[PDB]
Design a protein around this ligand. Structure first.
Ligand SMILES: *[C@@H]1O[C@H](CO)[C@@H](O[C@@H]2O[C@H](CO)[C@@H](O[C@H]3O[C@H](CO)[C@@H](O)[C@H](O[C@@H]4O[C@H](CO)[C@@H](O)[C@H](O)[C@@H]4O)[C@@H]3O)[C@H](O)[C@H]2NC(C)=O)[C@H](O)[C@H]1NC(C)=O
Ligand SMILES: *[C@@H]1O[C@H](CO[C@@H]2O[C@@H](C)[C@@H](O)[C@@H](O)[C@@H]2O)[C@@H](O[C@@H]2O[C@H](CO)[C@@H](O)[C@H](O)[C@H]2NC(C)=O)[C@H](O)[C@H]1NC(C)=O
Ligand SMILES: *[C@@H]1O[C@H](CO)[C@@H](O)[C@H](O)[C@H]1NC(C)=O
Ligand SMILES: NCCCP(=O)(O)CC1CCCCC1
Lengths: 403, 407
């Protein structure tokens, strides 16, 4: 069978920390490739995924890309890009080789700029995708006044900057905007002073424990308060200086965590004929000793996006592929228009793009006594919120008031 | 015997944010002709140029960087222009053991040896304005300085460097304000906090907005001294902009007396450099090669740095003197060119060429003051030798400069 070559770009080496994402997703990738080949979905052709180690480094990642174009087969598209700076470099240059890229793990909002990154697509929602979800949560609980607490690091300030445009033209007031670099205590005292009740927090796992320490000291917890913070922290992250552990847990009690949903909760058959639950069992058996990655479903659906895209492109050519050097502008545009048509039910839910960006599912969690528990989900396609009955709880008789 | 061809991989921005390659490519071509015609520089070698238009775009540059590295002949050096293109090529370079030499990069971030280990530039860092600023503060006895910037990476980095420089000199930054597009709130705060000595870092469009707000708030006069970058168009404050409320007369009033610092890119002296040209002769020679007038040509003012970049490399290659055996997988020759480039000391058309530990060019600064709607040369400062040339052309209302505080 003639091969349909795809350039796999990701950190794979054990020497690089992010190599766990690349390795954690390969069993999922193997599963989708195996099925597509068995079903002969791409008949007469077959999907040829070639893997190249970026090592999560700008120079090594660029040379890996350059070496793939030079010595590798003729790739039709790019699959991957995990680390934000390496992905930005490759994604900005794509047009030069008429290569469409689909990432499954690069969540940096920067990449949504189609003036800079027109050939870039991602199956994973970006860090900003939590914002239309939070707006729905605020509307649901009648929270019209909010305060913000942001760490002065690009990852977080990007999210806070996006929140401004999401809450604009909506009946929601950001009464207090507070930033911090090393210590949140001064900013937490200012929020308390301005009588903020609903706090939208954007900060890392290390700063989170400091935030909740200050919260306990300033009594910014309990029935009167609602903290809405990142949902992507390690489990038992708080266990890992002035506050006590019991006092941290007391201030942490009831916080809402927000992050993308790793897999669909719907027991409905996907494009592969398996439900998300069946795929998850298949993935856990196949991964063996390799540690699981939360991006696995996004990588699995990613392969299906490529296969379906190649199918549509093959039809477009037949309506009128082998000699695709990186010079064929027309084929690149065909692949680009075919990927824009993507609309199927995958393991991560409905796989659809809005200007290269994934319209997906956002998970809502709540810290309850010892851990984060799922309390809801936001559907970005329908722009709908579903709050799980008899899970979410408030210390008072009613959810807190915003003033 | 025959002369061995040795190749430079260059990127020229013919369009984009800084279309500097328009005047910098002919300047490089002239410099190569000059070095190649001299039998005392590289008699065994012929320096050749292989180039591409980067369009001052990193994405576009990534396609041509590949074209330079993955096609014969082997290049011994990479020559990018724009800071964005240099940030891309100087970071990638270590993977092919390549020296990177920029003729147009101003970004303070490019003076990071950890990240850009083989990087040199004949264009100085935007931080070169800072030692001149600290020296003017010291001369005028100010220890309390306010800073206002437009939000851009270049301005943030320049003010970050100014902080460490003031601390050494026993000077402190009182207040630091920032704005993305509208400077109404930051200027109002400068009046409220009673700021007297102000360093303002912004582009031309934003400078007009700053100075309109400066008129409305009476933040000009005897009490105030503004420090700006001397890179603006001839009568920038008079330039019509419908986004601003203030009139030309009101604006000529607001800008009166302000100080500017500018990087010297052409030796003001009538001396002859290593090519045996004068600064004036180089300008005449370059104008002839150009299809259009210097005013229409991008990078005309930076063109002497591009000319000097070729000589810096030619002299470095002459020290090492072999060259044909250069391979991307070997550090040997690279480390030798590096040491030779690091020890550069010669007279060029832009002035005396030397690099600091970061690989960044050390140059003179031109100090000017706006006196009656016109800039007047009040002096020059040499950061390395700590020597200030004073013109005695500066003027103040009090007959002497004001003070940083209430008194
Ligand atoms: C750098 O800058 C200037 C560029 O204008 C150069 O100065 C010129 O250098 C010439 C010396 O080579 C100098 O020579 C001419 O003037 C002399 C007196 O009029 C005269 O004697 C010379 O003739 C030479 O002698 C024999 C006589 O048989 C001739 O047949 C030869 O052709 C000789 O050249 C020349 O007429 C010229 O006047 C001078 N001009 C100025 C303004 O300085 C300088 O050399 C340059 N340096 C370099 C190239 O290293
Ligand atoms: C790119 O696609 C968009 C959106 O397309 C839809 O969603 C896909 C998942 C799939 O189901 C498609 O068949 C859908 O059409 C296009 O924007 C739409 O354009 C059509 C007109 O043809 C119009 O019905 C819609 O209003 C548009 N949708 C939105 C959200 O604006 C767009 O034309 C495509 N661009 C291309 C091919 O260049
Ligand atoms: C070039 O190097 C040679 C070798 O020592 C030296 O004689 C010559 O003067 C050098 N040229 C310059 C202009 O420094
Ligand atoms: N004197 C030449 C400066 C070129 P630069 O360091 O790339 C910064 C430029 C590029 C974009 C527009 C204006 C600033």
């Amino acid at each position: 069978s003639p091969p349909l070559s795809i350039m796999g770009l990701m950190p794979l080496t054990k020497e690089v920390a992010k190599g766990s994402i690349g390795r954690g997703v390969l069993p999922a990738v193997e599963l989708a490739i195996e099925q597509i080949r068995n079903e002969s979905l791409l008949r007469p052709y077959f999907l040829d995924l070639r893997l190249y180690d970026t090592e999560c480094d700008n120079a090594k990642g660029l040379k890996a890309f350059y070496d793939a174009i030079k010595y590798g087969p003729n790739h039709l598209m790019v699959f991957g890009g995990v680390c934000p700076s390496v992905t930005s470099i490759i994604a900005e240059s794509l047009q030069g080789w008429n290569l469409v890229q689909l990432s499954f793990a690069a969540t940096t909002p920067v990449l949504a700029d189609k003036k800079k990154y027109p050939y870039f697509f991602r199956t994973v929602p970006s860090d900003n995708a939590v914002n239309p979800a939070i707006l729905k949560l605020l509307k649901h609980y009648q929270w019209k006044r909010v305060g913000t607490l942001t760490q002065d690091v690009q990852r977080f300030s990007e999210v806070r900057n996006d929140l401004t445009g999401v809450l604009y033209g909506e009946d929601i007031e950001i009464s207090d905007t507070e930033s911090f670099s090393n210590d949140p205590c001064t900013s937490v005292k200012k929020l308390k002073g301005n009588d903020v009740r609903i706090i939208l927090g954007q900060f890392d796992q290390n700063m989170a424990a400091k935030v909740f320490c200050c919260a306990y000291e300033e009594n910014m917890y309990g029935s009167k308060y609602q903290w809405i913070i990142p949902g992507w922290y390690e489990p038992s992250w708080w266990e890992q200086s002035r506050c006590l552990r019991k006092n941290l847990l007391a201030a942490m009690e009831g916080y809402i965590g927000v992050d993308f949903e790793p897999l669909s909760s719907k027991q409905i058959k996907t494009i592969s004929g398996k439900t998300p639950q069946q795929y998850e069992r298949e993935y856990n058996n196949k991964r063996s000793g390799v540690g699981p990655s939360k991006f696995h479903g996004y990588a699995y659906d990613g392969i299906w996006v490529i296969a379906k895209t190649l199918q549509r492109a093959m039809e477009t050519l037949h309506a009128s592929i082998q000699d695709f050097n990186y010079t064929d502008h027309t084929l690149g545009r065909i692949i680009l228009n075919a990927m824009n048509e993507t609309n199927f039910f995958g393991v991560t839910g409905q796989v659809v793009f809005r200007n290269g960006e994934r319209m997906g599912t956002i998970k809502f969690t709540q810290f309850q006594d010892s851990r984060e528990v799922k309390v809801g989900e936001y559907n970005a396609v329908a722009d709908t919120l579903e709050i799980i009955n008899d899970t979410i709880r408030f210390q008072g008789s009613e959810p807190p008031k915003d003033d | 015997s025959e002369r061995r061809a040795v190749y430079i991989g260059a990127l020229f921005p013919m369009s984009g944010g800084w279309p500097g390659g328009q005047a910098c490519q002919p300047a490089v071509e002239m410099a190569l002709e000059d070095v190649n015609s001299r039998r005392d520089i590289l008699p065994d070698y012929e320096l050749k140029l292989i180039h591409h238009d980067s369009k001052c775009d990193p994405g576009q540059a990534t396609k041509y960087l590949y074209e330079l590295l993955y096609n014969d002949p082997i290049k011994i050096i990479l020559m990018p222009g724009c800071s964005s293109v240099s940030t891309l090529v100087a970071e990638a370079a270590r993977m092919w053991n390549l020296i990177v030499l920029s003729y147009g990069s101003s970004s303070p971030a490019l003076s990071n040896r950890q990240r850009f280990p083989t990087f040199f530039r004949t264009h100085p860092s935007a931080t070169l304005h800072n030692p001149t600023r600290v020296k003017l503060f010291e001369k005028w006895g100010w220890k309390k300085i306010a800073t206002i910037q437009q939000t851009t990476e270049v301005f943030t980095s320049t003010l970050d460097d100014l902080e460490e420089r003031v601390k050494e000199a026993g000077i402190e930054i009182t207040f630091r304000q920032s704005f993305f597009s509208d400077p109404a709130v930051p200027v109002k705060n400068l009046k409220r906090q009673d700021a007297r000595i102000i360093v303002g870092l912004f582009y031309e469009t934003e400078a007009r907005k700053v100075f309109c707000e400066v008129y409305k708030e009476r933040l000009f006069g005897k009490k105030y001294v503004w420090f700006l970058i001397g890179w603006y168009a001839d009568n920038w404050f008079k330039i019509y902009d419908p986004s601003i409320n203030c009139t030309v007369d009101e604006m000529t009033e607001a800008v009166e007396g302000h100080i500017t610092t500018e990087i010297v890119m052409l030796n003001p002296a009538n001396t002859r450099s290593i090519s045996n040209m004068t600064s004036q002769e180089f300008v005449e020679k370059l104008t002839k090669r150009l299809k259009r007038h210097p005013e229409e040509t991008g990078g005309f003012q930076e063109a002497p740095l591009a000319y000097d970049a070729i000589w810096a490399l030619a002299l470095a290659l002459n020290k090492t003197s072999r060259l044909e055996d250069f391979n991307y997988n070997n550090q040997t020759i690279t480390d030798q060119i590096y040491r030779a480039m690091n020890s550069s000391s010669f007279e060029g058309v832009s002035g005396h060429v030397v690099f600091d530990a970061s690989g960044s060019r050390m140059a003179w600064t031109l100090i000017e003051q706006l006196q009656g709607g016109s800039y007047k040369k009040i002096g020059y400062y040499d950061s390395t030798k700590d020597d200030l040339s004073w013109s005695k052309t500066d003027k103040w209302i009090g007959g002497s400069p004001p003070a940083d505080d209430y008194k």
